[PDB]
Design an enzyme around this catalytic site. Structure first.
Site, short mmCIF file in Angstrom:
data_model
loop_
_atom_site.label_atom_id
_atom_site.label_comp_id
_atom_site.label_asym_id
_atom_site.label_seq_id
_atom_site.Cartn_x
_atom_site.Cartn_y
_atom_site.Cartn_z
N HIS A 25 -6.11 8.59 1.31
CA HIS A 25 -5.94 7.63 2.41
C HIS A 25 -4.68 7.84 3.25
O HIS A 25 -4.72 7.64 4.46
CB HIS A 25 -5.96 6.19 1.89
CG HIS A 25 -7.24 5.81 1.23
ND1 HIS A 25 -7.49 6.06 -0.10
CD2 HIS A 25 -8.35 5.20 1.71
CE1 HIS A 25 -8.69 5.60 -0.42
NE2 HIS A 25 -9.24 5.10 0.67
N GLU B 153 -1.39 6.16 -4.37
CA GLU B 153 -1.25 7.43 -3.69
C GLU B 153 0.21 7.86 -3.53
O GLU B 153 0.52 9.04 -3.68
CB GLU B 153 -2.05 7.44 -2.38
CG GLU B 153 -3.55 7.50 -2.73
CD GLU B 153 -4.48 7.45 -1.54
OE1 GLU B 153 -4.06 7.72 -0.40
OE2 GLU B 153 -5.66 7.15 -1.79
N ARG C 173 -4.53 -24.09 2.85
CA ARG C 173 -4.43 -24.36 4.28
C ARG C 173 -5.69 -25.07 4.72
O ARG C 173 -6.79 -24.69 4.32
CB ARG C 173 -4.26 -23.06 5.09
CG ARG C 173 -2.85 -22.49 5.08
CD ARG C 173 -2.65 -21.43 6.17
NE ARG C 173 -1.23 -21.30 6.51
CZ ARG C 173 -0.38 -20.45 5.94
NH1 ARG C 173 -0.79 -19.61 4.99
NH2 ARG C 173 0.89 -20.43 6.32
N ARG D 2 6.18 -24.90 4.13
CA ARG D 2 4.85 -25.52 4.02
C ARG D 2 4.87 -27.02 3.72
O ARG D 2 3.85 -27.70 3.84
CB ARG D 2 4.00 -24.76 2.99
CG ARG D 2 3.61 -23.35 3.42
CD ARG D 2 2.60 -23.37 4.57
NE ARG D 2 1.45 -24.23 4.29
CZ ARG D 2 0.45 -23.92 3.45
NH1 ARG D 2 0.47 -22.77 2.79
NH2 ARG D 2 -0.56 -24.76 3.27
#
Lengths: 244, 251, 248, 239, 239, 245
Positions: free
Chosen positions: A6, A78, A166, A221
């Protein structure tokens, strides 16, 4: 040419690098690399943007993970295949404690595993715990840079919306598992929500790799759901210095 | 201007679009849009690249999801807020059945939930099942394009490596849960692995949204010969033609 | 004399049949078989009553399953041993959506697995999904006769009472797992409850067998009865046989 | 007229019965009821056949459950609604212990919950345990006719095939959960498999109802009337 | 010394095959002193062990400490030394309004709210007591006229949140246990304690016999000698 | 005096303002640990809970045993918290599962594999059984100061000594499916050792605003044997306590 599927990188591209700084946003990679010596763009494929730089004479990689455990698991694997042994995540985060302010810096000791990818490396019993040396480097770097810093547990969610309870959403509802969950984590002293740390910490702690996690608080929050940076980024670079 | 937190899009940007084609790779977005009329780029933020085009006179969105259920969940939620009601995923895949050849096209009826984000929408008992109209449209489109098609179950994994029982890795180990799992899914008739569908299908099927999944096979995990970059590009182009043709039937 | 443990059937009895229509109630077996050519009784053992008939020159079986996944799993296994490869379940049902009316037809794409038997065939992560060809045939048959059809998810419960969140019971109690569950499935777009489909669909989808399911809506709890049911019966029966025609 | 949705019975039909003997097969109901006084048929709907009889002047019900926990759960619920407070399961069974012979009698103290319906009544942590009075009554009734009896744990499976680790099937495969399971139960001292007891025992133990189970051994896969007498004798001790 | 924790040898047991196992090491000598020829064997950590004689047969009294983990060590190591029957004697509260102080509880099976039981059998397996042991305890309670309740006990890995106690440092009870006492109450569970799920599962799954008796000391809603007298009298019947 | 708590037999007065406790498993080790500090005084002994007070740099310190396992640990920690303790330092013994860890080595636990049940009574499984950063730092830095051979990392914390630690030299000789092959799995994952209290201690503290650290001395290496044939960690836990007052 690439030695991995990737990332589009060869071992030779890393120039002996053994530490990677891993932001979520590909666009932030160049910015972070610019704080270091001899920054060079390596590759950009899908959500994986990677640059190389130098820090006190040693090669360092900056590579984005994209959002979430799955793409993070690809980048970490990777990078490990290419020789990276230490990973420092630098993120943005939503604080859930009343006493943590926007602009504060949070260092994660371990994460609540509200993800799926971590289970691909260790069963749920296993702690999503940061490496002690990486955590120490970040805490000491925070003192050096000068920032309001908190150290503790983070909740790491496979979603931005229902997993972080949320309600500003299309459905306006949250599945039973997450109904009332924010106040539960808050009572348990959890500092913040983000989306990559449970996978990063678990996959590293269970595979002989070192990982640490620091984030800048972009919303609180308890006051606000949708947000509305530099302290946090200077800290991750300063910590990398100490881990070389 | 943005009506949503991540995608950088407004309702005006959609021009009344109610269907989105959702590839994983942002680089595929322009190529898919180029199969339709008057395509225009809308935005690019993180892994979310979006274009708008017309299909038989009607606006359609093409928007990347990135890899995995987490980024997929963001794109789908935010597109839904903007007015999208039908989602067609177009992907690449590794087949796990010996009789499924590189070049074949797979239409997913439902997915094995080896992900985590789906659980944020429905408990595990709930099926990650595709919408019947979408699946019908994809199957019909495959017949129009002319393709060797297989219809069935897909395993949707939060990882590319241990969740798909790959041992060619840094550690060379696979956690207990996934040890011997590929043989298990094979015996159960599962066609392939990919990484977004369990989240896409579950989140849509439990929220009144229509979703379907089509993929081109770029490798077979049972076969010896690994095709090159080209052969794989021809396969992608084919499945991409099918997803656009399917979209025409769902407007 | 028999090739299987419960059904009391031999391969010879099936006369090459590859498709079975599978109602729950033995009383419905004769009725379904009667819409087809050359119908004949085969066997009756416990809740498994079987008849054979013929559609367009091909043998078809009709075999009851009894109530629940356990007895369904026996019939499906033993029918598969005898050579059946396609199973069409036909039921009557009550709906949980306010806009699914009595007289409507439901075609199930997949089921919520609130049963035990499905886990004896695949882990919970595996979808209790119907075969595409079967579902297609059912939806197409429903259209050909002008039924008001709903296509979607069904919740498949091991109980009639607490699993369907009924409180009009001896105890009046529903275990934590199921308290508030009907509202949750409703919000998730689940069409109805029944008791056999999670086992049927999981066992078939994970063993290379084709399965589909159709049901007639005879009641609706969230909307608050003799002639309607018989009328609704006849209509879903008509559909399952027309679907079977397309699948031979 | 019926007080319940499935069974076709009214409270009146039970004539004050508070104990039910609950076989699986409708074709066993009349045979069991015939061992008692004044046996009369009540109703027959689907796999639920019910008869009433008398034992030392007290009315007693015999009602079939059909195969499996779901069917069983309907019968127990609706009999409870009608006034039944004690349930005695009578079955025939294989065995998974080599020391257990055909003709032996098994009394189940508790069951391994390999079903799904029990979870609709209590979480998995809760024991599928028999009532002590019922178990006592069965054990002492077994002794009184000189029956060879084993008392212990039974494994209660939602399937006849893969849940009992059978490989002689269409697919020839057994899912990971049940691969190697029979050897595991054998090592843990489990006597046998059947298909109804986890549901029966859990729904009764978690709802204030008394339940017990006896079975006659007819086959043993590990090897190359009696039980009916016991359940009826046990019933008269529980009236 | 043979075993790692208890500091006992096979010779120390003088042929004992039964052990009475209280939680508190300080109660060991008190129980031993009720029988013939009581002799201290060893004391290490929470494991105090005495030998005594009952009808000319050697018996062991060994404390377990609090909880499944330490219980599991004592039972394992005693089984290694030849013990095959284990009788737990505890003191307990109650969660049912009709259960008074002075009442004695005999446990048929336990709700598995522990962790150690899972190290012996999966959750589907019943934490069920041995029939012979439970019978001996029930009969011994009749013998002395104690008011006895027989049934299900909830066996918790904690004294505080797992028993839904809010009078604590945090005042918090985790989602899993919020409303759990009311649930157990409606399901007919008699009491909470902290060792029986481990004891019963580990024994029922390894061919060992276990039973449990407890005296009620308090009641959440609203005679240690009496329970001790019962456990010793039951032991006589099990030798 | 009437006890302020149900099990420990202590009053807040007994603590003399102490806010830190050193918590061994074995009651017989309590006096030994308290003897290494100033002004040691026995407070109480009930069941597996033996408690002593002492002084470090003029500050009162509690030493209290937990007994074996999460359940008894959960009682001691809750009741000490009620009495005013806010910092807990476990000192234990452990079986090493890595081949190069020597008997006598000191292991500092950053977080634990939750192979226990009591931790679930405080936080769901997804929550990490993680040690407080300050406590861990104190233990690591104390170990360096005395030059101890020390390893820092993950510990597996089991509700049993036998099957959960995959011991086969037992009465049954059997290990349940869940734990078959488990030691090899933890070894491959870099887990250092097995013990029996840390998952409960660490979870119940991290989820309730209490600080906890965990250190243990190796008494057997499990790559070689199940049971051994027949005090650096202790010096370390006391030195670390000094840094946390």
């Amino acid at each position: 040419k690439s030695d991995v599927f990737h990332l589009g990188l060869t071992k030779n591209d890393l120039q002996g690098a053994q530490l990677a700084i891993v932001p979520g946003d590909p666009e932030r990679v160049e910015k972070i690399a610019a704080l270091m010596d001899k920054p060079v763009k390596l590759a950009s494929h899908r959500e994986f943007t990677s640059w190389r730089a130098e820090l006190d004479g040693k090669a360092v990689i900056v590579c984005s993970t994209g959002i979430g455990g799955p793409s993070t698991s690809i980048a970490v694997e990777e990078l490990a295949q290419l020789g990276i042994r230490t990973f420092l995540r630098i993120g943005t985060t939503g604080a859930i404690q009343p006493h943590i302010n926007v602009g504060d810096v949070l260092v994660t000791t371990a994460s609540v595993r509200l993800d799926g990818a971590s289970l691909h490396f260790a069963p749920m019993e296993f702690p999503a715990v940061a490496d002690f040396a990486c955590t120490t480097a970040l805490v000491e770097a925070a003192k050096s840079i000068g920032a309001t810093t908190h150290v503790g547990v983070t909740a790491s969610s496979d979603t931005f919306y229902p997993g972080q309870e949320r309600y500003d959403t299309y459905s306006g509802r949250v599945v039973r598992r997450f109904k009332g969950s924010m106040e539960e984590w808050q009572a348990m002293g959890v500092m913040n929500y983000e989306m990559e740390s449970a996978t990063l910490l678990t996959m590293c702690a269970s595979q002989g790799l070192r990982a640490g996690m620091v984030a800048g608080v972009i919303v609180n929050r308890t006051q606000q759901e949708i947000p509305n940076e530099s302290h946090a980024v200077k800290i991750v670079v300063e910590a990398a210095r100490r881990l070389l």
